[PDB]
């Protein structure tokens, strides 16, 4: 059996890190909800 | 049992100890999360029990004790924030500016964070930390890097 536990508030946090680029990928999702890559 | 608004973890004891598989967003009532964290079953929230109400596996996610209540959209030009909750470790807001999944059904916002599977069901918020969608559908790139989607559900 699965449970839930609180892990906080949903709060825009100002100074939070700021990582990670913006791709631009072209995807095709299957009948099972996975993502593929058409490339 | 807990029915505060919020950010929760989806745990375990079927493996090893308490095993972490995913997390979920409470609002309005009623949890949010992705469809492969769960599978569809039953919650527990302390004594009480959380029953599905709505699910698919096409857009991975399910609601429990009522409808999707999440409504908030990318505005396909801001930065926006992953709440990201990874097994073990506290909850973390991580600023990123998202990019795109180009299908042949529209362009969908995503997030370039690599981060445990266990975090799946992570909110992704709005400046005015609206839940936007949910981190955790995504593909592996070229680098071995993986890229979430920004995946979010239908207000009726
Ligand atoms: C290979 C890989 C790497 C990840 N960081 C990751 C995060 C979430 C989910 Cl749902 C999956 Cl399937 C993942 N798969």
Known sequence: ??????????????????????????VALDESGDFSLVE | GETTDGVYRVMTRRLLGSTQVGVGVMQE?????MWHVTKGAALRSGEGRLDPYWGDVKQDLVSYCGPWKLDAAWDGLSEVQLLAVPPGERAKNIQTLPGIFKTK?????????????????????????????????????????????????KRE
């Open chain 2, 105 to 153: 059904d529209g362009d969908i916002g995503a997030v370039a964070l690599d981060y445990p599977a266990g975090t799946s069901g992570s909110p992704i918020l709005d400046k005015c930390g609206r839940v936007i969608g949910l981190y955790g559908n995504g593909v592996v790139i070229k680098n071995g890097s993986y890229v979430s989607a920004i995946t979010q559900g």
């Open chain 1, 1 to 26: 059996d699965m449970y839930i536990e609180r892990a906080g508030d949903i709060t825009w946090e100002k100074d939070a890190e700021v990582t990670g680029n913006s791709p631009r990928l072209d």
């Open chain 2, 29 to 33: 009532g009623v949890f949010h999360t």
